[PDB]
Design a protein around this ligand. Structure first.
Ligand SMILES: [Cl-]
Ligand SMILES: [Cl-]
Ligand SMILES: [Cl-]
Ligand SMILES: [Cl-]
Ligand SMILES: [Cl-]
Ligand SMILES: [Cl-]
Ligand SMILES: [Cl-]
Ligand SMILES: [Cl-]
Ligand SMILES: [Cl-]
Ligand SMILES: [Cl-]
Lengths: 173, 161, 165, 169, 166, 170, 170, 166, 171, 167
């Protein structure tokens, strides 16, 4: 998993937005920016605010040619049980984001986000560009939530450089 | 995982009967017969049953110096979400059996029950004696339920000797 | 010896039902369900029963497209001699089941049923489906008999999922 | 390389102190405080500063929260100095409140897996080491994408929060 | 398989004693007497119990000359018994005066290089170990060729002659 | 090693023919007849002819039953000759009806696992190869224990018996 | 690694051209002229670029004799520039007539075996490559010992002398 | 390898002393003074003594500055002598004030990486070892390019300067 | 088998001068010069003249502190048998030299005189000095006889270099 | 080094100081057709032992008469050989030789014939006889202080030829 090197190919089951079970692959997205992010387990004893925040800003992301997708070492079936429970009662409720499920752990390992000791992933976030290359690495510890707006900043930031020929200094725009 | 050889030691999180999260080890049971059995996934579409049958006959088992315990590659959490949901609505409802969760897959592998290709365990059932030795191996395919009464027969049968 | 993976091919001498000595192979059964089961030694001091039960329910099994066959690390000749003694006097008497004899131990090892230390097999039972794939593993300790009815349950159970689902 | 929740890779090498001295700094020196190690490619880069500076400035604000920060690049201690002498106003860097590591050896960049073996310089990497000396945050930005110092802070504060809550007896 | 004038391969396994007991016999047990170890393929044979018996009979004659004899095959101690129960008259074996080794393990056959890895049984092998525990005679007959027990004796006497005078 | 029912180890080396020539003999030459290969330690031993001779004599009797015999030792073809020149009466060997192999190389002794690496000579080994070139009998006597030629015959006849009908076991 | 009379190690990396451009220079570019490659530790030193400069100055004199010269150090192309902007009068370097290689990779220093793995910088090395691209002179001074540019010339001239005729002395 | 600022490769071999003796010289013997070791291809080469000689002459001048010099080639101690006997005037070498190493073994040439494995002779190498026995200067001239002894001196003086002061 | 290095130790059966069978070792000779020489086979068709020449000059050798001994890959018994035949009838007759017999071939190999292909040794001749070191190697092809006088010359020559410090050049 | 008997002798190809005064690279294959006598000596201006070297040079004629060519070899330079050939035999020199003098500065040859004393770096008094077919047929290695007997070398060559001619 190096930068400016084709991101690790992932191909596995995912709980589509609606309710289908489709096998998703990173090559599917060849053409758009992709935001892959990981989370430890599913039926978390806290506020799925993090996972959700992405699902919500999903629209806002799509607006900027970027698709996002989650991932964890839980079963496609486990995802749904969680998507069935109402967001109001500690559930997750319908997501606008596909939810990867690598029961194999092959993906977590590929991105070096897996904690071999526990068997779950860290709060990782990667941004793959339209050409299929990895261009951003971020790995938060297990209790530290992420800032979705930042992810966006970064994406926009990346696109800026693709559009024009200059770079982006500290705290951009 | 050989017969008449100390069963593979397992030590991992388990959803106790009540609702606690306790790390259970096979050595904890040193003194009683143990019945370890595996199942693929948790919120299995259409398939619950089997797991329950064990939880119920749990009493009947305890009666004969044997404790039973489940196991699957699902999280202590994703599964709980399954002890509270009502048995009536495809749920599982309170279990009298501790439910092992090896997110690590270390246990499934140890008993050679893991399907490396899918990442889940087959319907395996093992019987460890009071001295901590493995004395019975049974591995059913993914769609073939087990007969709990038989497991008992076997345990009683073992004790007879 | 993994599940849903083509069962280990066995090809060795077997004491046919009648009295002939024929070399049997697992591929011969390609088309029917097969029940392979092992037992330690031949004459022993109380180990009839189990072996027989299979031979008897043999008919009942055949009724459900399944053939059964035994196996142990004893010679084809030792099998015969045991089949000659009358069931009534601790013997075995005519079997409706072919009796494999792997003097080589190649089979016991293939199914991971051999106790390398003693040189004999554990009470193992496997069910191969018509496509030649292993679909059930059962290994009982040396002193624990098996329940043939259960084996059937399992076979029927397997077939059920074949038709439906 | 470096894993999370595992003692961060020890670094021990020359650094251009805030004032103007040349002192060999080590990660163990900071055992007790949170540390923010961040990398940048080269030194007299037309627009690599800005980012570098922001840290130097928020240095005070960081110190306020028990965290010390330090830069690093594959340039010479002397090259750092020279860059520090030029006035911030004329594309320079001007006095920093941050020590500036210089691993001419590239040993550090490699240790944190931030080195681009092909070019020989480091990517915009940022790591947060806790007071116990363990790595707890990884961030690697591409060569043209600046970082958001405020976020680093958020993260540090965030980490500390979790420390305070849930504990001893 | 084994070398001459070199301590014979140690064997330690179950054997169907003369009477009817099941005792674990070892080659070291015989340290002091000459030993005749001989192998045979399978147990409930066809026409070859002859050979096995001849030894059992000349067992007395052998003992007379400080030599003990013992058989061996890859069949179970229980299979040996069952064969010893059938009356010699009806193709059986009947009571033997010789212990009958049973290496279900095949460890012995291999040690003497008498095992046919392909079939899993031993060839008609015969070895003579001296009182000091050293191998001093090797003989391996094909599967269908019987042995001449008198010869084995000749050999033993022959060996003793040499140790005697010199 | 080489084993039973497996093509016997091919040997190809100098031998002191019956008459007095020096010919290189090979086991394949005999493809068609039974062969009896037997070894002996050294040549001018103070008591090793007895045995060697017996074979030479029963050579005729053997030939009668489609079997050829041949000796072998780690001595030189020339050493064999010498020994053959001395009259049997004076501890010699006298003309043999059997070819006498000489593997100065020791390649043969090793091939049949009859060589005592420590001393460099062979043990009293005797092997019977069938007409198809397969080894069917192994016998290795210690250095001081003579062999019984009649037995070798018994065994050959015995083998042939089974090649015609079912099987023997006297 | 680098041997004499063997094609010099190929170098291909960024260099701060005389004027002010950033061009990737390669040793093959010079195929045809004699080249003088010389190393120096670091860029902004408390020393006097005298050594580095002397080359830049005699650059003309060198060119006069079909030889091009080029520096190299493990500092960034940007660092070179910065050092080139400072006026020679104030401890700077000032415009150079020589391209200044920058191997941030250290690949070059290693190739010529001038790198001090421990510190990460190069020793005062000087090599002379001939028009055919072969290495013909090795010189490695310690870190504090300056070089004598005139000598480098002597050597070049000396080498050329042999090219036309057939042998030289001191 | 022979690296800078690392103890120079120890050399210990026969050398034709100034006078005419054959003594085995070692680099440790010089521990205390600066040493100038220099190599040359072969011995009786029609042209290119000159170089070797220049050193012998400036030997005095060198000694004046705490430095001893010594030559080396893959030729025999005897071959050196024979060359020293011929009068400098007739293409000879004549008495040298410098010990002349002879590594018939080639061990030395290799140690300093001056050997041309293909031909079997050394290149015009010159190394300066400091009083602590460390290598501080490397110079390797091609086979046809003479060296400038004055420079070697410059370098030595130069080295000493940095030592004194600093 | 290098020069000026302790000769390869040999320890094996040898047909003593008289008629005994004694196991001889090179260390036994520690103190005298030893001449070890090999020959292919025993009862060859060609005249043993070479082997014999040594046995005869044995006396002359002994006179100069040197003992000589033969060796071949033939059995001690075979040597015996060859020694009984009268020299006159192509035999060898009593030897004044011990005759080594390495049925093992270990010696021949040790001195690099064995022709692995045939199994016999080449006409090799080695001279070991009193300190047990090898000081002369000579290996003649199978059909080329040796010149015993030369072996002597060499021994004397070696000894000369011992008494005096000077060297014994061409002759 | 491997130099077995009845096996093609180790090929040598290296500078040699020809009889006259030229420097020519000689090879063992050049002699394919004649018998060759290769012999080694330690060093060149050796305090003594040229006598040995010379004897060969002289009997060179006598050797040639019997289809055999001889050639020396040592680890000294071609130039060193020359310089030794210039000094008059009368004053401890060598004087014009009728034999080519190999010079293996590389030591490749000494090693090939297993005549090199790795410790000192020079060769032992070795002498080998190669037959016209290029096979080695005689090995002789004398210690450093023991001179050789050229007549014997001849005896051997003649001896070899005899066996060739006959059978
Ligand atoms: Cl990277
Ligand atoms: Cl098992
Ligand atoms: Cl499995
Ligand atoms: Cl990690
Ligand atoms: Cl043996
Ligand atoms: Cl066998
Ligand atoms: Cl070089
Ligand atoms: Cl260096
Ligand atoms: Cl040598
Ligand atoms: Cl040889």
């Amino acid at each position: 998993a190096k930068l400016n090197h084709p991101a690790p190919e992932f191909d596995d089951m995912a709980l589509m937005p609606n309710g289908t079970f489709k096998k998703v692959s990173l090559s599917s997205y060849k053409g758009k920016y992709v935001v892959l992010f990981f989370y430890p387990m599913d039926f978390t004893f806290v506020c799925p605010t993090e996972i959700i925040q992405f699902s919500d800003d999903a629209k806002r992301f799509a607006e900027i040619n970027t698709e996002v997708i989650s991932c964890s070492c839980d079963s496609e079936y486990s995802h749904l049980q969680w998507t069935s429970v109402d967001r109001k009662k500690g559930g997750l409720g319908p997501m606008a984001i596909p939810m990867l499920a690598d029961k194999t752990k092959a993906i977590a390992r590929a991105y070096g986000v897996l904690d071999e000791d526990s068997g779950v992933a860290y709060r990782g976030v990667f941004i793959i560009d339209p050409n299929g290359k990895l261009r951003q690495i971020i790995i938060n510890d297990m209790p530290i939530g992420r800032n979705v707006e930042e992810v966006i900043r970064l994406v926009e930031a990346l696109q800026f450089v693709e559009e024009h020929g200059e770079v982006c200094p500290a705290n951009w725009k």
